[PDB]
Write a protein that binds this ligand. Structure first.
Ligand code: CL
Ligand code: K
Length: 130
């Protein structure tokens, strides 16, 4: 019954972790939500803190490599970063792919972490109402 959305960004540390957090909160009733990257850089504490400000707990999340099994049965794969698409294999027709680009908040102002977090929320809300 539930469909599957896969948020992809190299590192699975910041943008994709926020997407997974918002995805579970907003899309949870009709979607299984996952996030991954071609390589793992660890869940950034600033991403955990950014989600904590808006009452979303992402402290139990893990920084995961892309899983072949989850990828093949995904209804929608969403790349969120500049090099994420280049690091994906050819996806079969049952899997849809979209690019929702967001700026990298790594090493930037706190207002930028908040902006990117909120832009991701807006994109996921727009997705739910398609
Ligand atoms: Cl990320
Ligand atoms: K993850």
């Amino acid at each position: 019954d539930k469909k599957t959305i896969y948020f992809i960004c190299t590192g699975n540390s910041c943008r994709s972790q926020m997407a997974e957090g918002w995805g579970k909160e907003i899309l949870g009733e009709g979607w299984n939500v996952y996030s991954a990257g071609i390589e793992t850089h660890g869940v950034n504490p600033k991403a955990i803190e950014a989600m904590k400000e808006v009452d979303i707990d992402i402290s139990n999340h893990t920084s995961d490599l892309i899983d072949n099994d989850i990828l093949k049965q995904s209804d929608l794969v969403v790349t969120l970063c500049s090099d994420a698409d280049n690091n994906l294999p050819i996806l079969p027709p049952n899997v849809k792919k979209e690019h929702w680009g967001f700026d990298d908040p790594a090493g930037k102002e706190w207002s930028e972490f908040q902006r990117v977090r909120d832009e991701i929320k807006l994109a996921i809300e727009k997705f739910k109402l398609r």
